[PDB]
Every structure is written in C-alpha cells, then in structure tokens.
C-alpha cells in the first residue's frame, strides 16, 4: 500500500508510521524535505517573474500599437490571457501554499485553484489549436472565396473558452474531481486514482482523446498542410529568394511549435497513460510534479514562441520597452 486516502485527497505516502496528515491541515514535510518545498516556491517565483511581464507586456503593447489589433492576432491575445490565468490562479497560489508546506486554502480553495489553473492551461492549448486552424485556412486556402475576418476570430476565441470549460467544469460537478497533487501544494484533475464515485477512468479517457489526441491531430494536419503548401509554392517559384527564405523560416517555426506542444503535454499524457495501464503503483509526490513542471513552464515558453518570435509583436515590444524609439 503506497498512499493514504481521505475524503477529498490522496497523499502519495504510506501511513504505516502514522505521520501522514491531511494536505489541507498540516505541512507535508514527510513526503519531501522542507528545502524541496522551498525549491518549489523558488520555481513558482521564476514562472511568475518571467510569466507575468511577458504575458502582460503582450496585452499592453496591443493597447499601444494599432497595428497589432487585427483579427488574426485575437487568438494570441487570448493565449496571453490564458497564461495569466495560470500565473494568478495557479502559480501565485502555489508560491504561497508551498511556503506553508500544504494546501492551506482547503477543499473549496482546491476547487478554485484547480478550476482556474485548468481553465487557463486549456484555453492556452485550444488557442494553439485554433491558431493552427486559422493559419491552415488562410495560407492553404482550403475554401475557395473565404476571407478570414473579425467574426471568425471571435468564434475562434469563444471556441477555446468552451473547450476549456468542457474540461475544467465537470470535476466541479461529479465527473472526475480536483484534489491536491504531487507535493500537495497545488490542485489538479485527479487522473491517477480510480474513484468510481466521480468516474475518474472515463474522464481520463475523455481528456486523453478530446483534449490531447484531437488537439495533436489537428495541429499536425494543419501545420503539415501548411508546410506542404509552402514547399510547393517555393518549388514553383525558385527564382524568388524571399520565397525560399519564407519556406525555411516557416518550416523551422512549425518544428519549434510542434516540438513545444509535445514537450508541454506529452509528459502528462505519458504518465496518465502509464498509471492507467499500471493501476495504483508507487507514484511519489516528486514524480507527479514532473509532468506539471513541463505543462506549467509553457506560460513562459509559449509567449516566447508565439509572441516574441513574431516580428510585429517583437518590434512593438522593443519600441514600448525603449520608451518609444527604435
């Protein structure tokens, strides 16, 4: 027996010595040293210090630079708002709880932080998906006559909200649940204990299929098409040096975007899959934190990839950061 169960929680440490306490009531210094809790706070501190300015700066330059306010940019703004839900719903809460060594806000607060942290990360994910769809549509022109405008952009944003709710909301009302996780200082979807009263198993399958596999398939198709279209245009236009460059830069971005998506979600997927296939084995607190590390850090690296590496945003950020010049 590798853990300790409780009404709203599961502590990945055995209570044979009787030292385990509820993650809502007392420090968890028996499942990790105090210093590792410090390191956890240090880490959240990093993600806040990098993730706040980068994502906020994104919203700010958009207010300052008329040119950024175009429909194809809406989903990138959305992305930055989502990253901010992660930073304030999740990262700050976790900075705070980790320094107490347990989830001091209790089961209801567990639901608040789990909801907003999950909402944020899911809006982000569906943003990356919608952005790929939009790009496919605009560049690959799979629909004759179609012109992408404001209204489609809004529908793209709303779609992500809805897909995110379809993921974060259920565990608030019967299907899966939010419980503290890994080191018990932050809360997420219970994807690792069979808890029939909430139907964890099927929810995990739904997550895997609808919120990982679909996303992954849509992104590969769209960007695969996009790279194909751009290779073809270039091959038919080798007299144009610019076009040859666009093809190289675009292929490079796609590799980067796709690898980044994998790094962010594959670990959670790989771990949820394993646990599902190897029922209730000894999964330690620090091991359950690895997929979380990968997913959470995306509130920094996504804006680097999708915002800072985008010529327009970058120029506008530079102009705004240098007080108005250059």
């Amino acid at each position: 027996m590798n853990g300790t169960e409780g009404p709203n929680f599961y502590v990945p440490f055995s209570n044979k010595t009787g030292v385990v306490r509820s993650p809502f009531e007392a420090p968890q210094y028996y499942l990790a040293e105090p210093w590792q809790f410090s390191m956890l706070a240090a880490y959240m501190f990093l993600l806040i210090m990098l993730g706040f300015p980068i994502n906020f700066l994104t919203l700010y330059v958009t207010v300052q630079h008329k040119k950024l306010r175009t429909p194809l940019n809406y989903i990138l703004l959305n992305l930055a708002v989502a990253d901010l839900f992660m930073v304030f719903g999740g990262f700050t809460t976790t900075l705070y709880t980790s320094l107490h060594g347990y989830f001091v806000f209790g089961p209801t607060g567990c639901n608040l932080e789990g909801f907003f942290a999950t909402l944020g990360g899911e809006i982000a994910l569906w943003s990356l998906v919608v952005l790929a769809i939009e790009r496919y549509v605009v560049v690959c022109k799979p629909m004759s006559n179609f012109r992408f405008g404001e209204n489609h952009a809004i529908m793209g944003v709303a779609f992500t909200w809805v897909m995110a709710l379809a993921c974060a909301a259920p565990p608030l009302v019967g299907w899966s649940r939010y419980i503290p996780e890994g080191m018990q200082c932050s809360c997420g979807i219970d994807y690792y204990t069979p808890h029939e009263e909430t139907n964890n198993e099927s929810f995990v399958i739904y997550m895997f299929v609808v919120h990982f596999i679909i996303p992954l398939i849509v992104i590969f198709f769209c960007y695969g098409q996009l790279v194909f279209t751009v290779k073809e245009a270039a091959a038919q236009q080798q007299e144009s040096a610019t076009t040859q460059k666009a093809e190289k830069e675009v292929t490079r971005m796609v590799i980067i975007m796709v690898i980044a998506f994998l790094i962010c979600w594959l670990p959670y997927a790989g771990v949820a899959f394993y646990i599902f296939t190897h029922q209730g084995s000894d999964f330690g607190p620090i091991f359950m934190t690895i997929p979380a590390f990968f997913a959470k850090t995306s509130a920094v690296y996504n804006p680097v990839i999708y915002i800072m590496m985008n010529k327009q945003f970058r120029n506008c950020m530079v102009t705004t950061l240098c007080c108005g010049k250059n």
Partner: peptide
C-alpha cells in the same frame, strides 16, 4: 503566400 504568411506571423 508571402502576404498570407506575414498576416499570420510566420514570416
């Protein structure tokens, strides 16, 4: 493609 690529932030 070029104008399209610029529009979507890829080039």
């Amino acid at each position: 493609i070029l104008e399209n690529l610029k529009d979507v932030g890829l080039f």
